[model samples]
Target: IQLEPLPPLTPKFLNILDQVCIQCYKDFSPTIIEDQAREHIRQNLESFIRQDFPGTKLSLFGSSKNGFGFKQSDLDVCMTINGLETAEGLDCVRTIEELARVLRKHSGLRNILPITTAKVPIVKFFHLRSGLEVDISLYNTLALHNTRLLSAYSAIDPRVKYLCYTMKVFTKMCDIGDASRGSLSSYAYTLMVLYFLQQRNPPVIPVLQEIYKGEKKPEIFVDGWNIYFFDQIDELPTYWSECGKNTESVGQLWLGLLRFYTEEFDFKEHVISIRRKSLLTTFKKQWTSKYIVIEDPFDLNHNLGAGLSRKMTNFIMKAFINGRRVFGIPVKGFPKDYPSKMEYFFDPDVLTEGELAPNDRCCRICGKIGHFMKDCPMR
Candidate 1:
């Protein structure tokens, strides 16, 4: 569901998240729910890929495959066997180990985690560098076939097949479904959604398997999952393009369509069971306020995270600066003559006040402030 209007947030912080959204949202438009997953994963993994896995293929696979990702979701990426040559399974395992080691050591990564799950022969890790838990998994071509396998199993029920196919296609343009192909959660979520679709009667969507079965079994494999009836496979109809060309528009579309489908078609109990819960419950309970004030950068006292790391603040800033509202946090107080006169966020003691410094009002320490440092003789 589109989120409710978030309560106002105090400014005392620079709203970079708001800026990120404004600047990048268009670029990251989610064509479907899975597109959101892919966008998030792409953002978190881009730097990693550039630094460590350059030229390596990164494809998102798993739960993102069928779109049921939650707010705290992580991405799954497939490290295809394009660059690394493997003679044995252990070689593939070793390559992943080496890659994980390099990833953990990156300056941008934090909480370096690694996991070896039996479900597939891949190594996974979680990094907290960006303050978001980034779960990274590395799987080779052979391992990625797991998705096809699961798809086959899910295809047993027409509902599973259709939903999965729809979700996969939805993510094609948008990277909606943790398209990283490198996360366990993505895989796990894919399974859950498949399970859900599989159990649905009259089916939410038809799977390749059942269609294959009905068509009398022809031979074709998606990635690696076998579909006996190739004739049964058909391109998804175009009318279902709720997520059009961009992320927000697409997200908006999918949200409406999914809401409609779930409400109108799904079991009532399932609808009630999956009510959206706030991920920032703690922030909400503590940060409630009737009115919020925001000061220019360096007003750390008012920053809830000591510096505006809150989504509410980001949403609020977007509402005010852009005169736009998404997730219901409208921008507020585009006051005329705001900060009418120049004010230094840092004191002369905090920063030297002078006309002789670089850019006169510029801070040397951060080169962003309206004042200079006291020790600098140039001030």
Candidate 2:
């Protein structure tokens, strides 16, 4: 892998990168749910829960609490009700169902639905005045910890948040951010960015999980794995004083991230872990067959990459390779007519849309000509 170092980025390219990122943040950053708005929603939910289930309490999670929320992101909440055990300790499905009924009857909410059959049981509703969607889950405390971890990383440097926003925009444009659709979640993409920063040559950020020590240090374990880290930013300067300084700009780091994941990362064999600086093998984790193995910080048994299908994995890899090529080279050949270089990256014609159809033939479904649906499967 040895090679001569390349020349420094020109001012022109740097300006373009910086402006693109600035515009991304301005255009995509979540419309600030005003403090009063949040309080109103919280109070209404609290009132509703108290009326029927007296012991339940609510907590916020996901992008709303994680500091990466988009303009239209849903408000994610979790409710914990006491003494709801059915000799099964507690049932998320049953609790969510009951909550759903209460929400449906409440005039304050609309479109009430309970998705109890999913991996995490949740009740979904719309806040009437705020025009915001809300998903209330049962006892998902780990998401709160994960949100705190993300917010802490965002506080380390401004570039972390900038690059995270850009990555999210890229994934949304490419249609690969939805986990339910067999693609990586936005949370997984954030983890990828943190791992990339941690792995950089000078290392833009330290592996917080690796350096925690002392009797007074905060520690907690949830669902089996310990989720302790150096959360005190006031003390981090002294803690990470021994680390080397990284001078790469946000633009350069963004380009390097695309190049690294596309060319250097061994997704099939290596695990994307923020827990340690050393490499983690898929073989050791018995996750050899998964296309991408991103270890959950607190939930060791969970792979955020577990839901990705092979087809989607290949699509994402191709996008990264294409992005590296587009941004790494000189910006001369791109269409001058476009508003910005970022637009050129997403020029639809640059990517093939797969096979197109013409010339009608015999109906393949019924092996008959003249008619397709009329005589197909049942006419």
Off by over 4 Å in 1: 1-54, 83-90, 116-130, 140-201, 212-216, 220-379
Q: lDDT per residue, candidate 1, 1-379, as tens digits?
A: 2324335544422242223223222333235654564666655565566677666556665444432333334555666545554434435556656766777666656545344432334445454432435444554443345444554444333333333333333322222123122111224224434433333332233333333333354544533444242222233233212212222222232222333333333221222111111112323334333122221111112211212223323332222221213222323443232342112111122112121122223345533322237633235
Most lDDT-accurate candidate: 2
Q: In candidate 2, which residue pairs clash?
A: 30-70
TM-score of each: 0.36, 0.84
Error of 2 at 234 (Å): 1.8
Please report the TM-score between candidate 1 and the true structure.
0.36
lDDT of 2 by residue, 72-138 (tens): 6688887776675222477666777778888887887888877665577678888888788898887
Identify the runs in model 2 with alpha carbons over 4 angstroms from their true place: 1-9, 31-36, 82-88, 214-219, 242-244, 333-336, 340-342, 347-379
Listing every candidate in turn, what is its Cα RMSD in Å to the true structure after a full C-alpha superposition? 18.0, 6.9
| Residue-level lDDT for 130 in candidate 2 | 79
